[PDB]
């Protein structure tokens, strides 16, 4: 529908408030990830059911994304039917899409308020295709409004809606024994190998490391973990 939204801040306070407003109870809460070594990862509460990674969508990154897409289309990969994937068709909605991917793929572990708007979105879109889900989001006012409100929160001031954004959010989740990167800009989830309920954080961080070493001149990365509380 051509709409443009504002980019969300990679901040647990912002994301946790967004989830609260969408009707999710707080026994799952995002937390910051301070580093990638065992000592810093040990500070992250367990279990962890999703990791949202903010990274730079630079020219170097796009070259890799293009290669990755062709490789997967030409060589194939496995993607279980259980995975909930939705496309991105709204500019700057990546934060909302990342949050939807994180909750949708862990829905049975969540505690929702009776009239939770996120629960409603997920129940109504459960059997829709990734494309239909994107169209549905384009018409789902409740999430559009909450995203807008959340976009104004944070340590930083929200930018103009027309300003260039070169940072993106993706979700890393564990579904049926594999680690999936869910990026609405891509044509499909990306299977990154095996993982488990207990090692999701560590395995997701190894993928984050890959993103970083591909763009050695960039420091603009942020990872938040959806942890039990």
């Amino acid at each position: 529908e051509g709409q443009r939204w504002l980019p969300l801040e990679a901040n647990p306070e912002v994301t946790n408030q967004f989830l609260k407003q969408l009707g999710l109870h707080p026994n799952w809460q995002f937390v910051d990830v301070y580093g990638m070594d065992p000592e810093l990862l040990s500070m992250v509460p367990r279990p962890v059911c999703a990791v949202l990674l903010l990274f730079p969508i630079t020219e170097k990154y796009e070259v890799f994304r293009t290669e990755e897409e062709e490789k997967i289309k030409s060589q194939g990969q496995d993607v279980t039917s259980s995975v909930y994937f939705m496309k991105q068709t709204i500019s700057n909605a990546c934060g909302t899409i990342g949050l939807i991917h994180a909750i949708a793929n862990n829905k049975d572990k969540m505690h929702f308020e009776s009239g939770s708007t996120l629960k409603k979105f997920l129940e109504e879109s459960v059997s829709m295709s990734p494309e239909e889900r994107a169209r549905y989001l384009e018409n789902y006012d409740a999430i559009r409004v909450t995203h807008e409100t959340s976009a104004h929160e944070g340590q930083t001031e929200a930018p103009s809606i027309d300003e260039k954004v070169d940072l993106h959010f993706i979700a890393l989740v564990h579904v049926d024994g594999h680690l999936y990167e869910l990026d609405g800009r891509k044509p499909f989830p990306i299977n990154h190998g095996e993982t488990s309920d207990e090692t999701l954080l560590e395995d997701a961080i190894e993928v984050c490391k890959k993103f970083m070493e591909r763009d050695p001149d960039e420091l603009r990365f942020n990872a938040i973990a959806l942890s039990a509380a």
Partner: protein, 75 residues
């Protein structure tokens, strides 16, 4: 004295500071070295979030301590 600030990517930024320096001052020093605006910075010491108004001494941050820097970026 020197303290080290580590980013998520693992980069170590070395700063020359004083116990009396406020967190705000430390962030400004990080901006001068890395170009990262203070607003986008969230500093951590031993698992504790640091607030702009307090000083390194307040948090008992001594010589050669390592702080962790989280970036409040918008995606």
């Amino acid at each position: 004295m020197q303290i080290f600030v580590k980013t998520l990517t693992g980069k170590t930024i070395t700063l020359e500071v004083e116990p009396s320096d406020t967190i705000e001052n430390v962030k400004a020093k990080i901006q001068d070295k890395e170009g990262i605006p203070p607003d986008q910075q969230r500093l951590i010491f031993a698992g504790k979030q640091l607030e702009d108004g307090r000083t390194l001494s307040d948090y008992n941050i001594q010589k050669e301590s390592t702080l962790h820097l989280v970036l409040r970026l918008r995606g």
